[PDB]
Ligand binder design. Structure first.
Ligand SMILES: Nc1nccc2c1ncn2[C@@H]1O[C@H](CO)[C@@H](O)[C@H]1O
Ligand SMILES: Nc1nccc2c1ncn2[C@@H]1O[C@H](CO)[C@@H](O)[C@H]1O
Ligand SMILES: [Ca+2]
Ligand SMILES: [Ca+2]
Ligand code: NI
Lengths: 314, 315
């Protein structure tokens, strides 16, 4: 098992990624998670992270891990539209089974004392072995760590598996002020993304929309979790995916098993200018620019099977 | 003991909570049928969710199967929506996709597919031995269609219509550039049908308008209490649906289950049908001898909340 820290934005797929990571203890040792008040009010995201962790901890061999609320603030907020859906998960019956909430309530205080970014920095730097950061939300936190600790931080990162950007496909940020070339996580904080993608000595695996677009949330598959209602994770996963792509889940799946996707190096830069394409992750020919390993043609079935099986961990 | 009920719904989250309330209370309600209207949510999804909930309950609490029909009703005022926080989603909810339940649904889906919902409402009501209570949680298009088509032959077989809709003394919830916000969505979706129903003499109507439904909001701590009943499919179902959310329709269904949910006051209700800012508003009319509608007032919130929590333990 390799150390993994989940740096997420608290949206539905962030939690599916969390489930994926957490449930695969053979491959992943989830030593921490941080939630950014991005796709949600860090509040609900933080709580759901904890409720999921506790549900898992009380039902399978998943060690408790610190959970930090990131202090990162958006450059460009996620649409209020979806965004705060963690609020809705916070209230799902599956995440409010008494023994689990009882645990969360007991360990909540210890977690409330963490500042997400510093926790990310500490978890990575103080780990004996290198840490794989699964970033399913904006890059504000990994960027903060780099800005603050440079190499002391990046050298301790096995690799940063990032869900974000759109390299050779359209983005998904369609607003009156944008040209749709940017992807949401990058668009949330382009500057931090620039820092991360341009950081040499930081191995980055990038699950841009190029790969995530090829593995959409399909009804028949989601209904298969109904075949596993005896498993809490299936009720959990099935329920989340049954709400308004497996972006983050795909990203986390890779962390569990890189067979999820081949990756090809691409020098990725980010447009941080308040321009229509703000947040666009673009190929750059600038010499010696750091390479990012963009996932390509993910193994949809492999991933879909992985998720279904992982959803049986408990 | 148990009275015949037909649920005429719109397939949103509370329509289903309403269905669970009706279906789960077999001592008081014999659910003999349901129809889904393509209002709030895509009727096919509402149809499937209704079937899946029905079969889940058939298999787990012996809920007798009943016909489910999709209404052909088309909106007068389309929900600018798409933001239907249910039906589609719900159809993929794992608790509703348990094989034995889905298998049963698949076995009876074809037959239900053949029903045109409005005609079904008419037949269920008219061919029933005892009177039928129609719990309408969606627009009134189907009750109106039956009234217009069969008149007295239909209404005389209705025990009463317990309707979720309208706003009498409070603001509505239809806030569009062209509206004044005094209309409530179920009525606004089809004002003429609503007018038809509210002005129909010899049709008893109980009306849960926003006046009463606003007093029972869906609160997180309450929704979270379903997490304490996860050994019950209905609590996973209800909790899950309310986790995505007022208890408009649930309240209305609750009243069908036990009228102590709310006292009702007779009000002559007309519906603004003209294309005015308040189109769809349910207003008191001074028309002489105009039919009375019994508007729910100050519902028993705790009674309702307890009822729903209890009902969600039916299985
Ligand atoms: N409906 C939606 N469209 C686009 C992005 C969305 C979304 N719901 C959540 N996101 C968030 O941003 C990232 C992908 O663009 C994912 O990490 C994701 O979780
Ligand atoms: N977000 C929302 N706003 C207004 C009405 C809504 C709604 N979601 C569902 N409705 C529906 O319409 C009626 C209350 O206006 C109820 O039947 C209800 O289920
Ligand atoms: Ca995310
Ligand atoms: Ca309704
Ligand atoms: Ni069909």
């Amino acid at each position: 098992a390799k150390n993994v820290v989940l740096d997420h934005a608290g949206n539905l797929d962030d939690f599916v990624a969390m489930v994926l990571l957490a449930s695969n203890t053979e491959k992943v040792r989830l030593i921490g998670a941080l939630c950014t008040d991005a796709d949600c009010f860090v509040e609900n995201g933080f709580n759901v992270t904890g409720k999921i962790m506790c549900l898992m901890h009380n039902n399978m061999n998943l060690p408790l891990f610190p959970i930090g609320k990131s202090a990162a603030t958006a450059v460009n907020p996620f649409p209020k539209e979806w965004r705060c859906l963690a609020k809705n998960m916070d209230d799902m019956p599956i995440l409010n089974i008494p023994e689990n909430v009882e645990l969360w309530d007991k360990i909540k205080a210890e977690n409330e004392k963490y500042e997400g970014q510093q926790l990310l920095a500490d978890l990575v730097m103080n780990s004996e072995e290198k840490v794989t950061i699964c970033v399913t939300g904006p890059l504000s936190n990994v960027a903060w760590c780099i800005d603050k600790y440079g190499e002391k931080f990046t050298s301790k990162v096995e690799e940063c598996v990032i869900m974000g950007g759109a390299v050779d496909v359209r983005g998904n940020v369609f607003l009156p002020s944008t040209d749709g070339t940017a992807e949401w996580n990058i668009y949330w904080d382009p500057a931090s993304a620039k820092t991360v993608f341009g950081c040499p000595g930081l191995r980055r695996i990038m699950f841009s929309l190029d790969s995530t677009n090829t593995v959409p949330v399909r009804s028949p598959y989601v209904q298969r979790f109904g075949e596993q209602t005896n498993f809490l994770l299936s009720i959990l996963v099935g329920t989340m995916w049954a709400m308004c792509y497996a972006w983050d889940a795909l990203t986390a799946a890779y962390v569990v098993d890189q067979k999820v996707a081949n990756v090809d190096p691409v020098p990725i830069d980010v447009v941080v200018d308040k321009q229509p394409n703000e947040g666009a992750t673009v190929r750059t020919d600038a010499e010696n620019y750091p390479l990012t390993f963009v996932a390509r043609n993910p193994e949809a079935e492999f991933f879909l099977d992985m998720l279904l099986r992982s959803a049986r961990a408990c």
